[PDB]
Design a binder for this molecule. Sequence first.
Ligand SMILES: Nc1ncnc2c1ncn2[C@@H]1O[C@H](CSCC[C@H](N)C(=O)O)[C@@H](O)[C@H]1O
Ligand SMILES: [Zn+2]
Lengths: 124, 4
Amino acid sequence: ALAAASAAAVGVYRSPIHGRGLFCKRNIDAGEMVIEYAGNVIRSIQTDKREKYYDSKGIGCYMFRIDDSEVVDATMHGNAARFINHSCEPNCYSRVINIDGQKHIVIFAMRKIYRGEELTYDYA
Amino acid sequence: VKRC
Ligand SMILES: Nc1ncnc2c1ncn2[C@@H]1O[C@H](CSCC[C@H](N)C(=O)O)[C@@H](O)[C@H]1O
Ligand SMILES: [Zn+2]
């Protein structure tokens, strides 16, 4: 697993792309699991309403689209992976994986990443 | 991917 490794590998700081982003604290090998997109799998029919709720309470909403019927809501139970910004020439990608029966969104490195480099991936 |  990697729940341990991740805190030592990545960190959250300001990003020239937008807002805060996830940056690399130590070199990450191409192929390496960088981090999980922690959250709860909700049915994508509920993203509209949940987002209404969060916007009304001034909570920042973080959601990751698994597919056309499930998204991972990271607003309340996420982790640092919700700050990963988008790029069309990224250095990461999402993959849905299955561990003992549970879905998981895990971020992998496309190339080797170097200290201080923002981590990105393609949204759509 | 985010905010949807
Ligand atoms: N590559 C990019 N260019 C412009 N805006 C981006 C972007 N990547 C992410 N964003 C913005 O960030 C959201 C994804 S959440 C990414 C973290 C965000 N920067 C934060 O501080 O919380 C998107 O809805 C969009 O608003
Ligand atoms: Zn781009």
